[PDB]
Every structure is written in C-alpha cells, then in structure tokens.
Design a protein around this ligand. Structure first.
Ligand code: SAH
Ligand code: SAH
Lengths: 228, 219
C-alpha cells in the first residue's frame, strides 16, 4: 500500500501538523524513528514499530501488509534524516510515498535565524555524515547565522575548524538540548569557549552560532526577555 | 494581553500545527501577514486584520490590538522566524512589555517535499532572501558555495541572483527547481539550470521557492 513519510515535529505534540495528527490517529501501523517523543507516539492507537538507529526492507514489509502506513520521523523528514534514501528505496520497489512536512528542530529555538542588520540568511549543516565521517565546513563557515545539527560529540573539532575558517572566536553561540520538551536546556557559550572544550552539552541538541542568539537579551542585565 | 506569533504553514490548512490551529480558532483577533493562505484565515472566526505590506506602523498597530485583548494572534506565513521580520516584531513587543509566545510552523523552505540534504550530494543547506528589509540586494558571497541553496523572495530578481552566484563561483550546469505556491492546488514546478536562469530563459511567477543543487535531480 501507501507510505506517508511524516514529520513528528521537534517533540512538543502540539507542534505536529494537523495532517500528521490525523494520520497518526488513523494509521494501522506507525514505524517510528529515533528522537520521536513518547508524547507524540501515545497519540497513535495503531501498532507501533521502532525502525531506525536494512531499515528499508522493514518499511517494505509493513507497507505491503496494509492500505497505508505512517513512517514517523523527528522534525521534518526531508532534512538530515536520510528521508531522501527511504523515499527512493520505496519508489524503486513500487510503493507510493507522500511526504508530510513538519516543524524541523532547526526552527524550535524560537530565535530569529534571520534578523535585520545581523543575518539575511542562514545555513544548517551536520556534524556527522552518513558513514560517520566529518563534514566539510568551508562552504558554510561564514554564513551570518549557522545552525549545526548532530554536532555535540564533535563540538570541539567543529568549533576549532570554524575558528580556522575565520569565525569570530568571541561570537555568541547557543546550544539547545531537547528543544520544545520539558527537558529543554539552553547553554550559552562563545565559539572560543566551545573550541577550548569548556562547554558541557549532551545530544540531541540544536547548536546555533551568530549574533541573533543575543537579540532578545535585556540591556541592563543578562536576562532572556522572551523566556520571561 | 499576550501576543502569539504564529506560523501559518505554506498554505495547506492541514500543515498548520495543532497549536496554531487551536489559537486561530479561539483568537478574538488575528493580525495576519501577507501570503497567509485564504483557507487558513477562513478557519479563524475572530476579527481578522491585515497587518503587513512600514514595519514601525505594523508594530504600533500590533501593540494597539495586543493591549485591547487578553491575547491576539499575529499570523505569519510558513514559520514566523525566518525571512518575515519576526525578530523585529518580537523585540518591539518585549520592549513595550507585551508578553510574546513564538509558535513554529512548516516553513515554505520545506514545502517542496524534496530532500535538501542527501548522501553524497549535500550534507547541509542554506537559505537566503533576494530582498532584504528595505528592499536592498543580498550579499550572496557567504552562500555561493553551499551544496544546496534555497532562495526565497527571489523570483523577480532571479536573473540578477543567478549572475551573482555565477560570479561568486557556482556552476552554470547546476540543476535548479522553482516551486510556485507550494502545498496549494495551483502548485507548479519549473526545472532549469543556473545557466538558463542567468540568461533570462526561465519564467516563474511568485510566490516561489527556488532550490539549487544536485538534490534537485534526486527524484
Ligand atoms: N527536539 C530537539 N532538540 C534539539 N535538537 C534536536 C531535536 N530534534 C532533533 N534535533 C537535532 O536533530 C539531530 C538529528 S538529525 C534529524 C533532524 C530532523 N529531520 C529535523 O528536521 O529536526 C539531533 O542530533 C539534533 O541536533
Ligand atoms: N506556498 C509557497 N510556495 C512557494 N514559496 C513560498 C510559499 N509561501 C511562502 N513562500 C516563499 O516565502 C517568501 C516570503 S518570506 C516569508 C517566508 C516564511 N516565513 C516561511 O517560513 O516560509 C516568498 O517570496 C516565497 O519565496
């Protein structure tokens, strides 16, 4: 049958799209990935099978057993999750696929990635490639606002490299662990501090570099005007 | 009262978030931006006020409505925090002591359903606008060489954008794709090389999403 590649959002169940919610309530089977919040899953009454971490072959065998199935992925399925590969593989083996976009975690910090006088665009890059290798940061090194995903374990190397490539060592950066969940933890640090191995952060985390990080901070004191 | 800055999604009302939907159905007032789908607005029973288009005026107007209700919804297309001057709006409100809550949305950047990142092709992507606050032109240099580049508000100035990307060192043979009114019944997709674009050989009308890179030929 049919396969819906659905974005679950960053975690907060209210950030699911209406289409995703309806599909989850209605789906006979939901094949979910890693980083899918238990809150989102508890909304699904059908059979819940974990697929991820050879994933292709499993998707195929459930898609055949039903009229349609939902393949659930964190955030938006088409960025940094190999969603592209799953789509190809499923089409190549005669299975229709309909992508349902979602709120990507790149947009879960609430910060304006673009802002007048600070950044007129942004870039997003992975700290880990398919196969486990290191990313080539040159093409991204100087974009006003840089967002790094899957970059916690390698934060020191990534920072040293960005510093090599020319970013301001004093640049403010923000790490946001489990954005949109009750375990959300923001860690502020300057690039240089990250390169010196001084910042404690655990995955999964959103890593944002650039002056925008600082937009909503009070003037008279280090206070998050928007958090309060 | 409080101001909820809400992402309306790219157009399809089904791509609204549950939270956005809840707020829109209950808001006594909805201050909507431009390019917010007509089907999304029809869902809001409250007072609807078009608020967009200078930015100081919008602020003054946002502040006015905010003070006259327990809460109001400021509705923006896609996600409120990218390319919509959402940061300036939030900043203004905070400075005037108006509580603000940001509700993310499905950005038009992801409305084509295409993989912006893909094995061996692109390990990240960039997004830039062809029009800055004030109407000026973008310094494309920092974005010229990213594997997958997505350009918003780049339809009218496409020819110029293409040329700059070429002067900045990008490949003329690079495949690109234009997706007009993504997620709507009139969606339309136009293929074309960076070459044909710089040559004025491509016709696309706004609003459109402009994706550049090999991932364009993945599907
Ligand atoms: N709730 C969350 N908080 C912080 N980072 C998150 C997150 N959900 C996903 N991520 C980031 O995403 C990486 C997994 S790659 C999958 C990304 C997903 N397609 C999306 O659009 O968000 C993690 O290592 C982390 O960097
Ligand atoms: N349905 C749609 N199809 C194609 N492009 C769209 C679109 N809706 C918005 N856009 C793009 O967005 C530009 C407006 S700038 C506002 C972007 C919005 N914040 C978002 O996250 O999507 C347009 O010029 C166009 O390039």
């Amino acid at each position: 049958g049919r396969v819906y590649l659905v974005g679950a959002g960053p975690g907060d169940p209210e950030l699911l799209t209406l289409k995703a919610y309806r599909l989850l309530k209605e789906a006979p089977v939901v094949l979910y990935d890693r980083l899918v919040d238990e809150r989102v899953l508890a909304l699904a009454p059908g059979e819940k099978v974990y697929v991820g971490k050879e994933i292709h072959r499993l998707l195929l065998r459930h898609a055949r057993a039903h009229p349609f199935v939902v393949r659930l992925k964190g955030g938006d399925p088409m960025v940094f999750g190999r969603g592209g590969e799953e789509v190809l593989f499923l089409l190549r083996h005669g299975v229709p696929v309909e992508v349902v976009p979602g709120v990507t975690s790149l947009l879960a910090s609430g910060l304006p990635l673009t802002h007048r006088g600070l950044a007129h665009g942004f870039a997003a890059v992975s700290g880990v490639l398919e196969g486990g290798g290191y990313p080539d940061l040159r093409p991204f090194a100087r974009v006003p606002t840089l967002v790094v995903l899957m970059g916690v374990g390698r934060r020191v190397w990534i920072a040293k490299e960005l510093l090599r490539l020319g970013r301001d060592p004093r640049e403010p950066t923000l790490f946001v662990e489990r954005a949109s969940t009750p375990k959300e933890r923001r860690v502020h640090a300057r690039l240089e501090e990250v390169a010196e191995g001084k910042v404690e952060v655990r995955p999964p985390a959103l890593w944002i570099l650039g002056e925008v990080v600082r937009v909503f901070a009070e003037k008279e004191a280090p206070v998050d005007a928007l958090a309060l």
